[PDB]
Structure formats: C-alpha cells, structure tokens
Amino acid sequence: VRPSFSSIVEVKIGGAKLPDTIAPMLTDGWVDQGVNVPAAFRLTFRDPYHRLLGDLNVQFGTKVVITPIADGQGKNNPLLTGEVTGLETDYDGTGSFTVIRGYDYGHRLMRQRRVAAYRNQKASDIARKLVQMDGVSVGRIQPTKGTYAFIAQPNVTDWDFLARLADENKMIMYLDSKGKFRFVTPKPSAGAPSPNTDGDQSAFVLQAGHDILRLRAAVTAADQIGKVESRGWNVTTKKKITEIAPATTDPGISIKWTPGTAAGKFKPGKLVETANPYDKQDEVQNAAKALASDVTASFSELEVAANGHPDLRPGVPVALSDVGTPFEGKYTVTSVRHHFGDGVAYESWITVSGRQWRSLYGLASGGGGSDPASATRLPSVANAIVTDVQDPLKQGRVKLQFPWLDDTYVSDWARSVQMGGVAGGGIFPMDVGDEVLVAFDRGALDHPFVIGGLYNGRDVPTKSDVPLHDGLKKKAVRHTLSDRQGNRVDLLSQRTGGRKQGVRIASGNDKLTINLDRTKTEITVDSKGSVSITGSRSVSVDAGTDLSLSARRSLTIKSGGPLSIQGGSTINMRSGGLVGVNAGGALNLGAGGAATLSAGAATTISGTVNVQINSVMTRVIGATFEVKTPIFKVATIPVPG
Amino acid sequence: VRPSFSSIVEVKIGGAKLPDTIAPMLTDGWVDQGVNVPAAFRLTFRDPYHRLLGDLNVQFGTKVVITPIADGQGKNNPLLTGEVTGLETDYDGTGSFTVIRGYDYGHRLMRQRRVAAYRNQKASDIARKLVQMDGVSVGRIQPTKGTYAFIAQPNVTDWDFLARLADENKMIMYLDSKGKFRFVTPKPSAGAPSPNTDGDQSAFVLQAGHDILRLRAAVTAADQIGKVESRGWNVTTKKKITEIAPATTDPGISIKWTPGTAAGKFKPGKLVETANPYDKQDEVQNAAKALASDVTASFSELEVAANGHPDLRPGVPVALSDVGTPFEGKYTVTSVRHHFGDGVAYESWITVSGRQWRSLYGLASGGGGSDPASATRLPSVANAIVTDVQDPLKQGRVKLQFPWLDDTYVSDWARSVQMGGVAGGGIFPMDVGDEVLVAFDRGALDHPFVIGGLYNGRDVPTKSDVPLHDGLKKKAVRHTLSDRQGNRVDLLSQRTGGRKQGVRIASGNDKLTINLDRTKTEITVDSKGSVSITGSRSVSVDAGTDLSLSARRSLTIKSGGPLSIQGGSTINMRSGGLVGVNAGGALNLGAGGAATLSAGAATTISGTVNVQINSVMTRVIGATFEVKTPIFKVATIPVPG
Amino acid sequence: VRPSFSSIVEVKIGGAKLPDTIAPMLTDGWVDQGVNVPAAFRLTFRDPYHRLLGDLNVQFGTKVVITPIADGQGKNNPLLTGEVTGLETDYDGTGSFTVIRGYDYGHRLMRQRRVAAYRNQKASDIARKLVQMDGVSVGRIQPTKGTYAFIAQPNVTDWDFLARLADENKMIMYLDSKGKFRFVTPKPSAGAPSPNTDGDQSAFVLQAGHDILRLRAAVTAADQIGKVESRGWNVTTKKKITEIAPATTDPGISIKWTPGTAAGKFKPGKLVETANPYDKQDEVQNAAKALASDVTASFSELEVAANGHPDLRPGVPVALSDVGTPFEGKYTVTSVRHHFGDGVAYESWITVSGRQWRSLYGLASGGGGSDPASATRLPSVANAIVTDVQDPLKQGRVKLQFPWLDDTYVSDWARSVQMGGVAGGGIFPMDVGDEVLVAFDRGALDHPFVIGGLYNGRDVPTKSDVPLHDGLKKKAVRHTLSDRQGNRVDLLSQRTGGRKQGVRIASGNDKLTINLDRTKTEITVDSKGSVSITGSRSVSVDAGTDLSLSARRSLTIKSGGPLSIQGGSTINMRSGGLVGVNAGGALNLGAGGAATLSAGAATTISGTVNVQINSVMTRVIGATFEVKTPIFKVATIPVPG
C-alpha cells in the first residue's frame, strides 16, 4: 500500500552482503540524493567495543550499494551504488557509534581540479570526454542546442565546470541508481497523475493528512520579472547583439498560478546579465533562456517529509493535491532524503527548489554558493608568452600561452590594442617569443586581450648612441621609437655631454641617417650610399647664403632645355687642363670693359668664314706680321710712321 | 500602564476589515521593522481544512494594514501598511497553518535591478526622482550636504544603491506607518526621557526587572580608533587630498562612556579607506564623516525583549536605566520586532546595532558577504564605443558608451592614457565611432579609463603594399605607425620577396615619399610635385663621387654674389642653338695650351676701341687679306719672304 | 590522577586577587585558546542588583590573569594573561549576569590596520618588528627558510598578515601563558606517549570510555592528492619555474594511515595554485611545501571533550588510544577550550583541525567569504605617481608611489610596458613627476605594472599649432607623436580651416622642419640653419622640370675630375661685373653659326705664340690698320681696290 508496515535497509559492502553478525549492529541509514551535488551515504553502526572496522576490512575506495525495502517494493532496483570516502567514530554519550560515509560513483569529478582548453566541441561532447576520462560509465547524454568555438577550463573542479555548463544549457546533472552518468533535460511536470486521483492507487500522489508527516510549501514573487535580457558583442560586424526572453512560464512547476501573473500584478521591470562574455546569437539566446529558467525556478519551493516509497528517485513527477488554492498540481522532485534512525521509520524528504541547493540549508557549506579563491574571477592583468601569429584575418590578432597556468594551454586568438581607429591605423605585430601583458574581458579567462610587449632579462633593447637618462637633474633625454632591428626614429634632447638635440631618423646599420640637429640648427642627410632627390613639376628651389656642390670624380649638369647662369658678380671658371665649348650654334661674347684672349701655346682664329676685326682703331703689335696671300683694297700705299 | 491586560492585532486585507468568521483563525502575528531592510509581515492562521485562501480571495499585490492594540493605545496610528508578497502553508504536526507574508509599501525598490546614469543632481534629488519613478508616495526628504557630478548605477538592486548612498550621507530610510518614504537624519539620542525618571510615567523608559523580559547589552572596544582618514586624488591640480576625522563621539549612543576613552586607553592607531574613488573636498569630507560614524556605531549593541508598547516605532529615543555602570543612558532604536504567538502575549524586541544588520543572524543570509557579482567591481578591462570627443579641456578626454550594459548610458569624460608625459606628449585622438579598450579605477564604474583603440571587423588597418608577415620563420617584417588616413611612418625589414628594408615616410597618396632604403644603400626623396630645400646661413654642401643635375625644360642658376666653378679637369660645355656669355663687366679668357675660336657662318671681332694682336708671330696663312683703310708704320716696303 | 575531585578557577584582575566578597559571585569561566585566532575569556559573574562593575572599577585595558586548578596541578602556572576588551550584561530569565570578555595580548595585532612596505628583511625579522612596534614582549622566534625582496602590507590587519606569513612558512603564532609572542614550527606528533601506555599515569593520553566524555573523530579523503605543484615566472632569465611536492606524509598526524594511501587508492590527480605571484626558486619551493602541508592537514579532524586538565596547552602532542583501526596513534592539538559552568565541571575541549578554524560553527563568523572589503585583491587598474627613475638594468623600469594608499610606500621597479619586443624596441622613459596608469599582477599589490602616462590639470604643454579636432563632422585631424620638450613628428590630415595635410617632422623650436605637404604636392626641407646633404658612392641625381639654384652671397662648384655641362639649348651666362676663365690648358671654342667678341673698352688678343687667322675670306675692316713691325711674304704689292 502507500505507507509501510515494516521497512528494511539492505547494504552491500565490497560486493558481498553484510555479514549476519554485523547486520544487527546497524542503526542509522541516511541517503541524501540531489541534482546539484553528489549524493551522500551515512551508515552508522553501533560498535560499543570499537572492533567493526577491524573485521569488515573496510578501507575507503570500496564499492557499496544501498537499497531500501518498504513492503514488497525495492527488492530489485538498488537505490544508490557509490564509494566509501570517509570514516567517523562518535562517542556522543548515547552509544559509541562508528560512521561510514560515502559519495556517489562519480564524486571524482569534484575531487579533480583541472585546467584545459577545448576547441570546436559541443557541450555534450565535453561532458562525454570529461566523464570517461574520469572512469565513470556513460548513460544517456542529450546533445545541446549549439556548439562552442573555444572553451577554457579556468582551474576549476571538473564537477563545477560540468555543473555550470548544464546550468547554462538548461540541463540536469543526473546520477542514476547504477552509477551511470546522465546529462538529461528536466522531465515535464505534466507527467504526474492528476491530483484529483484517489491518492491511494499510486506512489506519486501526496495528500494532506494522508501521508504528509511534515509540509513546507512556499509560493513567492520575490524576484519574478516577466522579461529577462542577455546581451553580447559581435566583433565580425561590430554589433550589439541582444536577446529578450519571457519568464511567464515554467516547465517544472504547475500550480494553477504562473509567474506571468506575478510579473503583471506588479510594475513591469526587467533584468540584465552583465557577468559573462558572449559572441554569437546562439550563445546569447541560450544564456537568455537559462536566466529565464533560473528566475522561474524560484516561484515555488516545496519540502515534504513523508512516509515515503522506494520509488521516489530524483527527477520524477510528483502530484500534490488537496492543499489549497495556489498549491495544487504537479512538481518535479529535485532532492530526496531517505532516512532511517532512532524512533523513526523509513522517512522520505522530498525537496523541490529548482536548481538551487535549498537542501542542507540555503547557505549550506558557504554563503549560499561556492566562492573559491582559485576561481575564474581574475582581477587586473597578467603576463603571457606569444605562441602563434598566423591570424587568418591579418589584423594583428595573436595567440597566447600563459606560463603560470599550464604547459599545454594556448588559448584562442586575442585582439591586441593598437593605435588605430575606425578607418585604419598603424600596427606593431609581435614576434613568436615576446612576453606580452594580457588583460581580460570582465575577468573571464576565455577572452584575453593583448596590451603590449614587456622588457625582461635576455630581451634588452637595442643599444643606442645616447643613454636613457643623463644629467644631475636627471630627466628623460631620449624617446626612441624603433623596429626589432634598428630602423628607428629618435626624438632626443640633452644639455650634458655631447649635448645632442633634435630628431634622428636612422637605419639599422646607421649608414642612412636624417639628423634634424638643433644643437647647431643643422640638417644632416648622411648616407653611405646613393642619393636621389626627384620631382615632377618643379625641382628644389635651393637658397641660403653659401651654396657648395663639391663632388669628386665627375659632375654632370644637363638641361634638355633653356639654361641660364645669371651670376651677378665675378665668375671665376678655373680648369685643370682643358676648357671646351661645343659648336652648338651662334656663340657670342660681350664685355663692358676689356677683352683678353691669352694662351701658352700657338693660338688660332679658325673658321671657314669671312673673318673680321671691327673697331674704331686696330693695332697689330705682333713682332712679325706675315700674310701668305695678296693684300687688296688698301686705301693708301703703305707708309712708315 | 506600562504592561498590558489584553492585547489585540487588527489586520485589514484589501481595505476591508477581517471577516468575523476568519478573525479567530489568526494565531501568529509577526512584524519585523528595521531601518536597514524593508519590514516583514508574517500572519499565520490555523486552517485545518485548507480553505482560507479560497475565501478571502487574497492575491499578492493586495494592500494590507497591521496594527497592534495594547490597552487603549494604538486604535489610531496604524503600525504598518504594506503589500502581500508570498504565501506559505505548513503541516508541522501542531496544525495545518496558512501563512501570508508581506513586505513594506516600497519593497519594489529592492525588486527592481537598474542601470542608469545621473548628472548634476543632489542625492536628495536622486532619491526623490527615483522613488517617484517607482510609485511610492514621498514623505519628508532632507536635502543632502554636497552635490555630485556623475553617479552611475552599475546594474544593482535599486534599494541597495539608495542604501549605499544613505550610508555615505549618514542618513536613514524610515518608511512611515502610512508607507511614505523618509530620507531622514538619525534622531539625536539626547532628546530622550531622563534615565532617573520614575520609569512608569512614560512608554519610552525601560527598567531592569520592571518590564525587561530579556536583555543583551554589550559595550566593546573591538575596533574603536580615535582618528579615521579618507583620501582621494584631484586631477585639476595633481593633489593628494586627505581628510582626517575624529571618532570620539557618536550621536546615537550616550552611555556615560564615549569611544574616545576606548581609543585613548589603547595604542593610538588609525584606519584608512582605499575602496572608492573621490575627486572633491566635499566628497572626501563626507566619506570621512561616514566612516567615523560607521566606526562609532559599533560601540554599543543592545537587544531588549520587553512587554512592549505600540509606540515603539523605529528611530525614536529610548532610555535604559538602572542596569549598571556603563549601560545607563539613552539609545536610538534601529529595529523592532512585534510578536504575537503561542503562549506569548504582545512582545517587542528592540535592537540597537547602528548600521550593522545583525538582526536574526549576524551572518544574515550571506555572512556579511555582499558579492552578487552585479557587475559593480568590474575586474580587468572591457570594450566600449566612443560617443563624444568634444573635451572642454583639449586633453583628449572622451565620453564612453558601453554596449553590454545599457543603450542609454554614455558616461562622463575619461582621461585616455597617452604615450607622453608631464611637460608635453604626443596625442592620438580617437574618432566618434571607435571601439576602444577601457579599464576601471579600482573596479568602480564611475571612473573609466581609455587604454587604446581596438581592431575588429569592418575596421581593418590601412592597406599596405607589403604584408604583415613573410618567410618561413616569418618574424615581424613591418612596423607601421600611421594616422586614420594614409599618412604613415613605416619601419620595415624584410629578407625574402621584394627584400624591402629600411624606413619609409608616405603621405597616403604615395606621391610624397622619403625612402631610407637599406637593401640597396640609398636615400630616395620622391614627390609628384614641387620640391623646396632651403637654408638660412648656409646651403646644402653637397658631396660624394658622382653628381648629376638633370632637370628638363629649365635650369636657372643664380648667385647674387661671387660665383666660382673651380672644376679641376676638362669642362665640356656643350650647347644647342645658342651659347652667349653676355658679360656685363670685364671678360677675360686664358689658356695653358692652344686657343681656338672656330665658326661656321661668320667670325667677328668687335669693340669700339683699339683692337690689338700682340706676339712674336702673327702669320695669316689663310686667304685674301682685305683692309679698307690706310696701313701705317710699316718699317719695310711689303716684300715676299 | 586523570579526573579531578574538585576544580577551581583562579582569576586576578588588575594585578590584585579577586576580592573575597566577589569570588562567590563568579558563575561561568570560559577560556578559548587556539593557534589561528587570539585567545578569549568569557567570564560571567552573577550580579542580581547590577553593582559589580561599580566596585571592581574594571576598565577595558586592564591586565587579567586566569588559571585553572584541578587537584594540585597548575597552582603556579597561569593559563592566559590578557586584557579586558568588552563588557556585557544579561537578563536571560535565569539571573542578571554580568559578563567580562577578554582577549589575549595578540589582539592588538588584529586591532591595527596598516599599510607599509618592508625592504630586504626575513619573515622572522618582519614578525619581530611587527610585534615590537605593537608593544608585545617577544618570546622565541624561529628564523625562516629564505628572505624576500619586498613584502607590501596592502591595508591589512597585522595579525592577518603575520598569520599569512606563518601559513606560508609552515609556522604557527601560538601565544604562551605569560603572553610572550612566539613564532614556532609545529611540534612533531611522534614525540608523544605510546598509544598503549598505562593511560592513567600520563596526562596526555585519552582512552575511549576512561575520560572521553564526548568524541568526534573523522578521517576523510575529500581532497587528498599525492602531488601538489606551484608555478611562477622568472624575469632575469625568462623562465617558467615550477615545483612539485609530495603530499604523502604529514608531521602533525600519525594514525597508522597516511594520505599516500588515500591518493593511491583513487585516480592520480594533481593540484595547482594560480593566485600568488612568485619570482625565485626558494619562494616557489616554500609555497609548494606550504600547500602540501595545507592539503595534508585535512586528513584527520578530532574533537574530544574530556574531563579537563590544566596541562592541555595548545601545540602539545596527545596520544589517542583504543578507538579503532584508523584512529589510534598521536595528534598535535590545535585549539583548547576550558569550560566551567552551571551543572558542568571542568571540561576541556581539544580540537585538532590543522590550520583551519573549524572551532567556531562550520563557517566561523564568515566562512567561505573571509574577504575583507578592504582587501589586497585590487581589481582593474589605478593611478600612481613616479618617485624614482633609476635602473640597475636600464630597461626602462620605474618606482611608483601610490597617492591613495600611503605617503611612505614607493614599491619596487615595475616593468613598464612599451612597444618593444624580443630583439629590441623603442622606449619612452617616464619623468619623475609623471602620473601613470598602473595595473596589477593578478590583483596582487606586490607586482605593479606601468601602462603609460596620463593627462591632468596643467599637464599637457604640447602647444601644437593646429587644433586636435576641427570641422562639423570633425573627425580626428592630427595624430601627434612628440617628446617632452617638443621634438615631434606629426601626421596631420585636414579638410577645413587652414587646410593642412600630410606629415611634419618638426624640431623643438620649429627652426628645423621637414614638411610632406599634400594639399600642394610639395616637400619643404626648411631650416633656419646649415644644411648638409652627403653621399658615398653617388650623389643626388636631381630631376624634374624646373631646376633653380639661387643662393645669395656665394656659389661654389667643385669637381676634382671631369665636369660636363651638356645643356642642349640656349645658355645665357650673364655677369654683374667681371668674368674669367683660367689658363687651365688647351682651351678651345666652336660655333655652328656666327662668332662675336665685343667689348666696351680696351680689347686685346694676347699670347706669346704664333698667332693666326684662317679663312677663305679675311676682310679685316676698321677705321685704320697699324702695325709696329715690317710686313713680309706679301704675295703681291698692295693695290687699292
């Protein structure tokens, strides 16, 4: 029937049934099963002479199975198979008891604290991999809605990472009777029999006064809001992505009243989540749905201590009837406490609290939730080593490799801050061995950012002509901007020593240099190589007060057009053995004063032309006047004096 | 008198008096009224057959009024007027009770979670506007001492924001009986009935043994320090602003002993606050006063459970007398618990604990651990969108819009970090639509800081002729510094492909380029336009080994002073068409060897002066010699040979 | 013997024995001693008329000595010399009790909150200085393993800081009976009486059922891992330092089972610490050993309430016998509780729980959280003022003094991040007076990092020419890179106003400037000084369409070799006054057309050589023809016409 006449607990340790000489020694039989934390075994035997543990040879690390038997139900279907973890002995004054404590076959997930990174795997794939890796048989795994680009395990316990993953995906972290892992969606509450049933023809119906020893049901509108929004940033388009989801319905609870009424009956507020990064529409939609489920899970909180039945496993629909106006209907169980003890028969505490750990006190072993000191809430910045540069987008994006976290974690691409903008800007890409400063997006490890490279040992900067600081007043003297080899621009200012001042656009080998030197107001374009100054429509209009073009070997001046030497004063045109002027055309001279044509060797006045010597007077002072042709047209016969 | 004979609870639901058929059912009446958190109603009726909620037609959101009546006091002046929030049913083994839970008319402030920014409004103005937004009638609001400039509400429950503001301003939120907000200063403890009074002529005097059912009074010097300082940074002057305030007095407590004695009797310590940013003297002084009040509020902790009186409202002075040496005097109440229950008449728990909400549990429900991760202490950095760059100071300050927080929050000016210094440095302003990386001052949202622009999709860097990485080892090859436009300063170094090395300066049109090219040692000054090299005291002293000046269509050389062409070897002065040395002054030519003046058309020697040919030999050896004028001074008559 | 016949509590207040008229009034004597928190008295007298405190003249800050006496043990050995801290009264319905709470002398350490930096001192030296400054006598201090460079005190209580040091160094802060501070290693558990000794003879042996009133012994493998590793970064070599330490043994516990048996019987996991920066091998080794000890301290948790004995001081070995298989052996006590009360004799509660504070509830006052709101986890960044720019390595580091933390804290060198790399990069050193934006390593204060200088009031004397923003749409117009004094490179782009575009490499005083101007396709190498353009193997090959070389007061062209003026068109060679060609060598001329040599004054044709005139026609036409020597070789006699 619904209650029980006699109830027994059958416990098997190490695969063998409990010895007949030890079965009467058992007193308490506690089993606390939940969907948020691993279930707990507490088997308390009475050992007045302190000899039990020396006979069972029980050492933690042994398989133990606990089954309840109420009437003829529960002979098959063992309740929970797990592992003995801790031992306790209590001399409380009412009996020197020996307590064996156990955890679920799968508690090892909480035992292991891991760091890792998973690339291009679905959440169900992550669950499958982690579980097997931990030696736990896989039951049924439900594929999740969307894939993840890159997940990082930020130094957390396996159980907690998987638990949050299930929370974000609106799942349940089920661990069934035979120790099989399960990642299953919540069962709909409608499945349970109608409360209008007789209440005695099944074991999933609770009637007020029939088999409800203790009852605590609460329906509240503490933080029920109709709309919940989750927001994120899209970098491939620079878009503010957002998702608004309703919180007016809930699958786990059906009590004739919905949270939509709670939202309507008060002012229409809204809730915002600003604690996790998001990138794609799928992730934002999933987060919005998860937050809506979280908000709607607090609508009803139920806790019934009943005579029980061994079929009250977690995650099953249970109908609550004849309680009142807002408390009828169906619920989905979340935690079940099977209790055997002094003066108490087989007791079952069914607690429906959504995904919260209301059981074992809301605060539980903390402040209502774990706040580890080695969590993912990384404040400020850290240092990292670059491992990859092969960005498929050529935006300077660079992979990282944290050296204080793990030797196999290399993260994903991280955008690096650069002095650019909306319409383009300069880039200073990093090498494959730099040590760069890394910040984080809202503290999350999944989204690192690169600020710039640091300076440490074995990475001293390239040496320069002048030191970093000088002078008694001890101010900055040089402000260097440089590449990784020596192609540099220097902005230096000094009043001591060499008194170097100004700007210096140098080269790697110092062969090429543009010195804007203020110490002597001198522009020095120095080059141990070729020089080339060119224009298109006009050439350098050189000016000043002293010009000089002294180049060895050769000097060629070409015009391809009109050429002019205005001068303005004496033009001393020296030579070194030859002066030549080509027969370009009508060559003409002139002078406002004298005109002299001297030489050292034989002169001549050539030309197949009508030579002439125009003048108001002409006097050949030649020591000898020789003509080898007849002389004509002389006005008078030659006369001396 | 002081104690009472008969005590009643008058509760009105929905504005109508409690029905006569329901009044006997009420058993438990609990009212918990405090000055730190909203008060609570707990009305527990006995409903064995579970039919109450189906007859009263109670839906949360309905108005409820609770009044106590002790003797002939309290018929008027209702105690509290609030709203039903949650429902609870209990089967505890002592009756099937139905519980209605209520909160204050103004609990909605804790219900709403908001993001917003307030500009140039006083704290009292903030409270008034905000409360009027939430549909709560405004009582008396006391004007704030100092005004603010920019307050950000960083995704917080509204009541918590208001409470932090009130704690900053040494204030109190006593919602009145009639549900009216009161932002009021604490009532001074001096204005209280004298302790040496008869103890029976007033309802504000408690005597040990007269009516004090339970007493718990503690006076401690756990963390009493005489002086407390608060410090901040002033940016308009670079000033370390500080305020030291005393903690030797406290308005709320007067127990013949002051915290000054506690501070003096121990070593003279000091306390510092380093958790919030401050900018002005007013804010720092207010923070120092608030911290001093907070420290002095822990001097005395009092908890008296007495027979009570319906006039024991919060925020009223109460005189405690005949208790001992240090426990006499007057206090100001902070929380009051009115209780009706099984085997208990009307009882009043008066608790004085200053700010500390130690009521119910010292840990309350979080062990004094308020870390809701409501994105308040934003860790590390985040991304933001620039909205305003006006800067009334021209220092590059920029208004920041956060895309993951709100669509209407645009913040105040943020001092972007610039790679300069104190006496002047280069400025890189950002456009009106950038995406920048912003840190925060000690995590507070009120003081964002811009680190630099980021790179995302649809904002690619300016295209360049050479790729960002090349080779098999493929180290960094190019280090570009550029404006949003094409003006660039490239520092490039390559070993493969085109083997481009050196420094480049480009104007974006690829016309004006300065190439310090190291692959072939060269300086190239290219420009699709005019060139101009100028000096003041001397001109470019050009040098090298192969000079060339070849500009088409024009070449003008001007001196305005002495001109010299030293040469040193052959000077081939070619020409085409015309070559004329039009010497204004005295011309003169000389030769170390021969001298030749040829022509093709006609050779002419001119000059309006006596021409002269002078040398040992002046032979013609040409052709016919014609003279058209008399020949003179011939020594010998012409003779061949 | 082991139990006691009659037990008394001897208390001395103010150095004088408790008065005879007050000794019967004492009711409750409670002492709580431990190695994690200061010891406490909770003495409780019965004062029905509330007059005790007015006669003893007790004022907190008075010395009090407390001792238990069970049989004839402890008559001259005091248990705890401390100071009265807080007074307390009670009307609990069972008497009007007066309670005097006292704390051990070490409470002063928890009473002071300090900010400071300690320089080149061992941890033992730090403890000695802290204890001496706080007026506490120094007992025995054990020198620690290694020294530290700096240890900042990030606004923390002295006691918490010293406890952190003790936990780091595997040390305990037990305070002895006389009140003398000592900093001691835990006593080994092996140095205890054999578990199988007589039992009654030794006062350090507890037997199940003999004198164990209450017992709670727990042995668990909740988080037992064989190996624990600690990781850190070395900057003098760029190295990943790591230390793996075993957790298979523990000095404090010896119970026939070791944590190695817990680790082996499960999967071989590992644990990592990622919350504390580390620099040297010694520090990493110390951290690994400390974490291993912390993990192994949770193997056994013991709580024994026994018949009491005054020799059960903290930090002494105690042998636990005849309990079972895994619970025999020895323990090192961690906290002791001496209790005298109503209907209760002298009770001693021994608690062995490692370094954890499992003594108070399960979460003390604030378990899990214990995050001082004013803690060391600095989120995001802050502002700081440079105080020293020197560097023993010249890598650009700098010391930073914080203006919101302390006036005497200047920190260590911070590796400022700037655009460098593995093989060298540019550096911008910071001046002494700069204000820089400083991040933090993992939030820890000990490792600040400088990002870059900020801008504030009277901090931007760049004094640039063009404004930082112009226009209606008013995008960024200028991108300045400059030096503290003015030597600058500007990348400016405008469309309105003066319409300036291009690049400008300027100087401090603007005398020297290289303008790449794009509004007018021009290169302006302007300089109020000398100019020098030089080459090595070839000279500037100037080109374009209009050459102009116009320099006043001088113009010198030198070749040192062949010189050529190709020309190609008219060559106008004017002269203000005088012109000349030197007698270099075989000077020659030529003309494709006419040839004219005119002058305004005395002409001549010099040359001490065989002058000649050659042509088919030699028509020398003038106004006369004078020869000063005889004519010869005339072909015919002169003839008119």
Residue numbers in the entry:
A (entry chain s), B (entry chain q), C (entry chain r): 2 to 642
Pull text from the paper.
The baseplate module comprises a heteromeric assembly of the proteins Cis1b/7/8/9/11/12. (a–f) Local resolution maps of the CISSc baseplate with C6 symmetry (a), CISSc baseplate with C3 symmetry (c), and the CISSc cap with C6 symmetry (e).
Bacterial contractile injection systems (CIS) are phage tail-like macromolecular complexes that mediate cell-cell interactions by injecting effector proteins into target cells. Using Streptomyces coelicolor as a model organism, we and others previously demonstrated that S. coelicolor CIS (CISSc) mediate a form of regulated cell death, which influences the onset of sporulation and secondary metabolite production in response to exogenous stress and unknown cellular signals. Our model shows that extended CISSc particles share the conserved eCIS architecture, including the three core modules: cap, sheath tube, and baseplate.
